Design a protein around this ligand. Structure first.
Ligand SMILES: C[C@H](CCC(=O)NCCC[N+](C)(C)C[C@H](O)CS(=O)(=O)O)[C@H]1CC[C@H]2[C@@H]3[C@H](O)C[C@@H]4C[C@H](O)CC[C@]4(C)[C@H]3C[C@H](O)[C@]12C
Ligand SMILES: Nc1ncnc2c1ncn2[C@@H]1O[C@H](COP(=O)(O)OP(=O)(O)O)[C@@H](O)[C@H]1O
Ligand SMILES: [Mg+2]
Ligand SMILES: [Zn+2]
Ligand SMILES: [Zn+2]
Ligand SMILES: [Zn+2]
Lengths: 590, 529, 186, 75, 185
RNA sequence: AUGUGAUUUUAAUAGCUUCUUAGGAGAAUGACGUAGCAUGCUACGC
RNA sequence: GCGUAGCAUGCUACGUCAUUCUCCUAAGAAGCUA
């Protein structure tokens, strides 16, 4: 098989060996990538290992092509030549290749481990193809390291039709997906080398799995299957489609006398109409999530695809559309997994309707007239690429605010990412400024918005509301029970319980806490609907019960407080541990 | 069988734009040309399979005249006397291609290879000997044909099961491969048109007939209108070679199996079993040879009708008048064969009605004086015979007569014939329809045959077929061969370019230099080999 | 070849010849040594070049043996598939009506063409146009094969359900004929 | 050579339509096949062009299948 | 021919050529004949294996080319076929095809197959007042290089409107895109 | 977490021809080796 | 004159290698015909 070089796009057949994503590479580009980094294994239509009966020399700088095989320095035939010669690695299309100088960044992208905070900033300012490759390899590395697997080994080989399974106790196990590969790791001492990529689907009887392999060697007694690679779907579409400015609204048909509430955004709807992709930046609870609906009501004949990374944002959009848009001519898409509860009020799984709602990972290969990507703050370059590849739409609208919490990035544990490096759209907004802006709080009381108008924004956020005085600031130490590596605060929830009887108007509030275990256990203690800070972004809640658990770096970051507290429409009760955060907020002292 | 009927469509052909552009750049396809595309890949909607199986409604129950069929049978058998046949063991049957389908329901689990391998020779002979004293009804699918044709009607072929083909091969294959290995006989099957074979066929047809005139008829709806009586007759004439290997009950049960699996059996046309009223299924183990026996039967019946229906007092040749007298006497006044007169009439036919038969397509070199007098079959006699023994009207606009032998039959096996000069003598060369070759080049039936450089053998074979056009007087006809040669040259040039870019070294021994020289093809129509 | 005793004999003959070259002995002794060396070459090529044909034959038998083992593994799979197909059709038979009609027969033999006509519980009518619909299965029940069938479903060529109120003279053009109506014996 | 060009454009157009899964709607595939077979079996170029227009109207009618802008800009 | 065996054979050939030029005694000349023959035998034995390897290399190159090109041709068949379609469709350069394609680019696509028989119903969506003005004149409609008669103009609201309301000044009020139902003339 | 997909999927009998690869056999030409017969010559013995 | 041994030449038989050709079979791709 042949392909295209990642960093010059010329025809080639040389994959690299030690890159996670198994990329294609050109001739000169492959020579520069293998001569400068620790990656040495190279795969042409056949691997570049030595061809002696017993020998393991993979460094392409050593091997020689003799006859129709590859031999190391010792096993070299008399008439042959080395592969790594004249600045190129021998392969197909040898003399129709044009290299590029971008190997300075490709080496770093393919070499790093995505644990530092320089790796992520490198993967957001390179060329578009390098951006895509970096996002793809980052997703693969995440799936390999985080929640990886327990070391499995086959006790015995009943047959090649079905394998045997034995998970190591202490670590979890990932399920079947042909995209998963469990490298063979017979690690005793005899040829500790990948013996193939395998995937395991268990049967309905006994302890046996009908595996699907990629090699032709029988399983040895000591052979193990370790999840050291995952094959993400190769993405092609660019992170951001090229901009093209228009002079008139094309493909969208404006209305006259749209409504009373959305009359202020008429010029912004025109701005959306006159550009290919537009970006709207607005501090939290300032009106982005209904700006999408007003866009819909300003172009009634235009088919619209609302999409978002998580399930809460799409659900909030569903709420507002049902509140404003004709409920009959809408829809909602759910994946075949059907793992999580969704918004069951429109005709579900009806793609051909004029108003679709979906999660970016479950979009169908369709078209549209405008695709509203909501809350890009939770969007990685992979999600932008997926939405660009699946949805061909005349107009794009990326609404979001970088100041709120970013995507998980579980591997990131050292350093800190600035807002302008979360993804490509955040870089566009923070570098050259948003195309639209609307700062005026419309959801949470003037007191809390005044509080947050200093921590994150330099009092550039105005409020049009009244201070309800229902923003209670409490200082409870909240002894910590670090049970499952996720802080649980029994005294804090108990104190909430004892002060939850004192407030009749707060019985139907929502529980928020920056720790999943605390959120989950809060449901049993007092029965309120619990939602973590991460998944509560987008929804609107009247009364909120927040409990800052520990003095740490996770719950103590300003942005997570911002997104947690700004979700209170009329009032909120916050419990605290950090004094510095207690120093600058403007709440009732209780 | 299923809960929902299945509708099968036929896709259109894949255009080969490179070759069409080359052709139009070589001055082809211009307005008012004599070589214009006429053979395309026609598409069909979902009502193709069942609107084409419905043409069996033309098969009425025909009751053939018996005192005359029982004499046409003797003459037709005399035509099949040079051959030898019998039963063969399962280890002597040779299948041509083992990857071909295995009918229904066996196609769900594999091809014919699976059943020719899973079954040993012992349990193959077991099944065959089981069929010689038992009847095995069988289902046959109707498959739509995806091939280039000049008319939009769907083409359907009866895919017969493996349980039928295995045993029918073991039964018939000795005779069927003795027919395909005899040269100079009436049934020209197994005779090639290359290496001076077409000339040999056309000159054995002219087996000393006094005032020759070439003739060719056409059977409308040949395989869907053939009466059951004549298909049974063909199956019984093919089974006269088992005079020793088989007893009489064995032969009757083999005939019953042939009728139960081929003649009138269940037909699965898109997830549904219908009943086949009759007529030959065109995919059984003996389709070309059974139809050849049919065609000779119709020719001999036409001769008998023409000779008897003649007045009798106008017949001047006193030998032919007595021959007519004895023919009527041997038809309607004798109950036992008269082998002396059967031989006499067979000699008469081969002296005045030389035939050449390929499975439905016949060329005759009939005596002209006798035909004008009425002592031998002419076109009108064939039309009458078809009217009252096939229930189809043979329009005279599709049957040709040639009065000049110096230009061969007008059309035999879809190949026109022309007398060219080779070496020092003259030979008959068959040339095809130029539109057919051009449409075969332009419209391939797959997307990997459109690449071209992968398929140079495709164009080599097409040029082998189209070589004779070079000797045609019409220049636009002769240009097709040179078009194909130039396209092969271009294909090889760009193949070398692509393989020299994909590597740095071209092929070491590239012996394609002979496929764009006319000598390689010119040697394919010379008698030496 | 290289592991044969004849190879050892050839090797020792070559060693002796090279030693005599280093010894520079007479021509007759060298000539005799050459004769011994040459016969070793013939013996080496007598046994070798039979090894190549020996291994060639062994490989041919092994490849054939591999093929026959695979053949006897496909035979079992297809046999199991055929058995399952036959038995699954058995479980589909409507045994009560089939027994009722076969017990009436004299010899126990009945024509196949009626086994459905008198025992099949579900009937599918394929209709090419509206006139045939109105003439064959108008309404919600109809009469075929001297029985009374009730129309349970109606689909079009695209397998899309069609409500019985949509099949009208004026609504005929909008339907994807032919229509397959499925009814059950009553 | 305009008559022997509509007959090839029709083949390519019907291949394109069959690759967009018009085969799955019988009422439309029947008309498409009728127009294709009628263009192929045509003598007067005017009839062939009129049926070509009618058949290309099938491809233009469905909006989510092709991207006419991109395909037409390149040519 | 670039092989050590050829080196030995060529040097033996040169030695034999020098000897035959000298025409020395038979013993040395015939001994050189035998040595040349054995060296040639060794050289040809090596050349046969060289040619076998070369032929295997050519077979492998051809098979790899066939496989790569076949998978490439199958991989991109939809895009290639559509681009080929439009290349040919522009090459035709017909008035009707060009008109309908240029209209479909702007958004004036037909909602049903354009009918051929006289007096048949065509439903075409019109997205703009400029597209309406260019094609619709009075109560006539220029489409597919033919003149249709407008029967019924409806809106995205599915409310029947009349040709009077469609005017430059009044155009923004109408809920585009209009749908025109017309008959051939 | 991106394949709880897709193997959901039709393609006959027979004839002729071209091309490619593998195996065997046969033929012919050439080369090296062993054995046998004949001629010429040489060492010694008779 | 005879023998044993040695060399050269010629011929026969056998063994091995190289080249060319024919065929027998097996597998694969493709084309046309009924
Ligand atoms: C020996 C030959 C070249 C000899 C030569 O002429 N050198 C001189 C220099 C050539 N110039 C012009 C670059 C300078 C080299 C060049 C390209 C090589 C092939 C491809 O890579 C890969 C291919 C697929 C699999 O991998 C199996 C091996 C294959 C068949 C290879 C065979 C062989 O190994 C080839 C033909
Ligand atoms: N023009 C307006 N006048 C009054 N209230 C508004 C207006 N627009 C929006 N709102 C209210 O403000 C809230 C904004 O919600 P949302 O769009 O989710 O905030 P953001 O997008 O800023 O996070 C809505 O719930 C809505 O009720
Ligand atoms: Mg919002
Ligand atoms: Zn690498
Ligand atoms: Zn080595
Ligand atoms: Zn027999």
């Amino acid at each position: 098989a042949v392909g295209a070089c990642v960093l010059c796009n010329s025809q080639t057949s040389l994959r690299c060996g030690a890159c996670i994503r198994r990329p294609f590479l050109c001739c000169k580009c492959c020579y520069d990538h293998v001569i400068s980094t620790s990656h040495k294994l190279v795969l042409s239509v056949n691997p570049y290992v030595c061809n002696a009966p017993g020998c393991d020399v993979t460094d392409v700088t050593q091997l020689y092509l003799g006859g129709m095989s590859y031999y190391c320095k010792s096993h070299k035939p008399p008439i042959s030549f080395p592969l790594c010669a004249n600045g190129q690695v021998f392969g197909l299309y040898k003399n129709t290749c044009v290299g590029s100088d971008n190997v300075t960044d490709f080496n770093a992208i393919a070499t790093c481990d995505w644990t530092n905070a320089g790796d992520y900033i490198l993967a957001n300012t390179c060329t578009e193809r390098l951006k895509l490759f970096a996002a793809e390899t980052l997703k693969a590395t995440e799936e390999t390291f985080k929640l990886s697997y327990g070391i499995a080994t086959v006790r015995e080989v009943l047959s090649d039709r079905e394998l045997h399974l034995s998970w190591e106790v202490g670590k979890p196990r990932p399920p079947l997906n042909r995209n998963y590969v469990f490298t063979g790791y017979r690690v005793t001492k005899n040829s500790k080398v990948q013996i193939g990529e395998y995937t395991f689907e268990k049967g309905d009887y006994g302890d046996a799995v009908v595996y699907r392999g990629t090699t032709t060697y029988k399983l040895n007694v000591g052979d193990y299957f370790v999840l050291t690679s995952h094959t993400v779907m190769p993405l092609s579409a660019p992170t951001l489609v090229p901009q093209e400015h228009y002079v008139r609204i094309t493909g969208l048909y404006p209305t006259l006398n749209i409504s009373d509430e959305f009359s202020s955004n008429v010029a912004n709807y025109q701005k959306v109409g006159m550009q290919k992709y537009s970006t709207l930046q607005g501090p939290p609870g300032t009106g982005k999530s209904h700006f999408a609906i007003g866009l819909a009501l300003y172009y009634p004949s235009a088919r619209i695809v609302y999409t978002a990374c998580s399930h809460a944002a799409v659900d909030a959009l569903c709420e507002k559309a049902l509140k404003y848009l004709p409920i009959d001519k809408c829809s909602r898409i759910i994946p075949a997994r059907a793992r999580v509860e969704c918004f069951d009020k429109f005709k579900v799984n009806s793609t051909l309707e004029q108003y679709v709602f979906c999660t970016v990972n479950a979009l169908p290969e369709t078209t549209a007239d405008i695709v509203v990507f909501d809350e890009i703050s939770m969007a990685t370059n992979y999600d932008l690429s997926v939405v660009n590849a699946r949805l061909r739409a005349k107009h794009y609208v990326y609404i979001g605010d970088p100041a709120q919490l970013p995507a998980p990035r579980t591997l990131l544990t050292k350093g800190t990412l600035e807002p302008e490096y979360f993804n490509s759209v955040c870089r566009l907004m923070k570098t050259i400024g948003p195309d639209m802006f609307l700062g005026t709080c419309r959801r949470c009381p003037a007191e809390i918005v005044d509080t947050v108008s200093a921590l994150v924004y330099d009092n550039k956020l105005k409020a049009h509301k009244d201070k309800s005085a229902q923003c209670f600031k409490m200082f409870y130490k909240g002894v910590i029970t670090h049970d499952v590596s996720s802080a649980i605060n029994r005294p804090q929830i108990g104190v909430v319980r004892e002060f939850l009887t004192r407030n009749p108007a707060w019985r139907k509030a929502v529980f928020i806490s920056p720790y999943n275990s605390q959120n989950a256990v809060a449901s049993k203690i007092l029965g309120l609907p619990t939602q973590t800070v991460d998944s509560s972004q987008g929804s609107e809640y009247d009364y909120v019960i927040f409990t800052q658990t520990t003095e740490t770096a996770h719950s103590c970051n300003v942005n997570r407080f911002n997104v947690a507290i700004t979700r209170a429409k009329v009032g909120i009760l916050c419990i605290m541990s950090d004094r510095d955060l207690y120093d600058k907020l403007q709440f009732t002292s209780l | 069988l299923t809960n929902n009927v299945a509708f099968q469509t036929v896709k259109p052909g894949n255009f080969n734009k490179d070759f069409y552009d080359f052709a139009v750049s070589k001055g082809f396809f211009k307005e008012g040309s004599s070589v214009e595309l006429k053979h395309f890949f026609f598409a069909q909607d979902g009502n193709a399979a069942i609107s084409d199986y419905d043409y069996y409604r033309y098969n009425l129950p025909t009751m053939c005249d018996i005192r005359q069929l029982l004499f046409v049978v003797e003459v037709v058998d005399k035509y099949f006397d040079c051959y030898d046949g019998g039963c063969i063991n399962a280890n002597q049957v040779i299948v041509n291609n083992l990857d071909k389908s295995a009918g229904f329901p066996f196609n769900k689990w594999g091809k014919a290879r699976l059943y020719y391998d899973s079954m040993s020779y012992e349990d193959q002979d077991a099944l065959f000997a089981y069929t010689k004293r038992n009847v095995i009804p069988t289902i046959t699918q109707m498959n739509l044909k995806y091939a280039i044709s000049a008319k939009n009607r769907a083409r359907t072929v009866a895919g017969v099961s493996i349980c039928s083909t295995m045993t029918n091969r073991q039964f018939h294959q000795k005779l069927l491969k003795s027919i395909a290995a005899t040269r100079g006989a009436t049934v020209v099957i197994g005779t090639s048109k290359f290496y001076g074979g077409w000339h040999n066929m056309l000159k054995t047809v002219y087996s000393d007939v006094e005032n020759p005139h070439l003739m060719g008829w056409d059977y409308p709806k040949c395989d869907r209108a053939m009466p059951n009586m004549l298909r049974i007759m063909a199956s019984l004439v093919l089974a006269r070679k088992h005079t020793t290997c088989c007893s009489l009950s064995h032969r009757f049960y083999r005939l019953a199996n042939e009728c139960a699996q081929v003649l009138s059996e269940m037909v699965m046309c898109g997830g549904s079993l219908y009943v086949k009223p009759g007529g030959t299924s065109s995919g059984d183990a003996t389709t070309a040879y059974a139809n050849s026996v049919f065609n000779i039967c119709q020719a001999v019946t036409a001769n008998v009708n023409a000779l008897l229906s003649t007045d009798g007092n106008k017949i001047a040749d006193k030998y032919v008048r007595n021959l007519q007298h004895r023919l009527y006497e041997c038809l309607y006044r004798n109950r036992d064969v008269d082998t002396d007169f059967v031989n006499e009439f067979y000699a008469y036919l081969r002296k005045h009605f030389s035939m050449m038969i390929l499975s439905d397509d016949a060329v005759v070199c009939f005596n002209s004086t006798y035909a004008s007098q009425g002592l031998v079959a002419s076109i009108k006699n064939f039309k009458s015979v078809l009217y009252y023994q096939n229930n189809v009207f043979m329009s005279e606009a599709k049957c040709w007569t040639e009065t000049d032998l110096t230009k061969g039959p007008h059309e035999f096996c879809s190949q026109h014939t022309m007398l060219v000069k080779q070496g020092d003598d003259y030979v008959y060369l068959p040339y095809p329809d130029p539109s057919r070759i051009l449409g075969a080049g332009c419209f391939v039936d797959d997307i990997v045959k459109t690449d071209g450089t992968l398929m140079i053998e495709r164009f080599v074979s097409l040029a082998i077929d189209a070589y004779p056009l070079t000797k045609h007087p019409n220049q636009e006809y002769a240009d097709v061969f040179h078009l194909y040669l130039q396209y092969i040259r271009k294909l090889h040039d760009e193949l070398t370019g692509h393989m020299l870019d994909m590597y740095s070294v071209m092929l070491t021994n590239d012996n394609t230099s002979r496929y764009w020289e006319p000598e390689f093809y010119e040697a394919m129509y010379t008698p030496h080999t | 070849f290289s592991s044969l005793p004849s190879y050892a004999a050839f090797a020792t003959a070559q060693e002796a010849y090279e030693q005599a070259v280093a010894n520079g002995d007479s021509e007759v002794v060298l000539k005799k040594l050459k004769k011994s060396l040459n016969v070793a070459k013939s013996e080496f090529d007598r046994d070798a070049a039979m090894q190549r044909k020996l291994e060639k034959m062994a490989d041919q038998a092994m490849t054939q043996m591999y093929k026959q083992a695979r053949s006897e593994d496909k035979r079992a799979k297809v046999t199991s598939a055929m058995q399952t197909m036959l038995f699954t059709m058995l479980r589909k038979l409507d045994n009560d009506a089939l027994n009722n009609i076969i017990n009436n027969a004299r010899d126990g033999c009945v024509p196949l063409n009626i086994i459905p006509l008198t025992t099949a519980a579900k009937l599918m009518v394929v209709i090419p146009d509206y006139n045939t619909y109105k003439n064959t299965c108008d309404g919600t029940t109809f009469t075929y094969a001297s029985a009374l069938w009730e129309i349970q479903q109606v689909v079009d060529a695209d397998s899309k359900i069609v409500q019985l109120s949509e099949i009208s003279m004026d609504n005929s053009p909008n339907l994807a004929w032919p229509l397959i109506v499925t009814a059950l014996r009553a | 050579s305009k008559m022997s060009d509509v007959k090839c454009t029709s083949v390519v157009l019907l291949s394109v339509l069959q690759q967009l899964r018009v085969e799955s709607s019988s009422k439309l595939w029947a008309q498409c096949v009728q127009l294709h077979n009628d263009i192929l079996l045509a003598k007067d170029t005017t009839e062939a062009f009129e049926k070509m227009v009618s058949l290309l109207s099938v491809l233009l009618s469905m909006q989510g299948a092709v991207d006419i802008n991109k395909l037409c800009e390149e040519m």
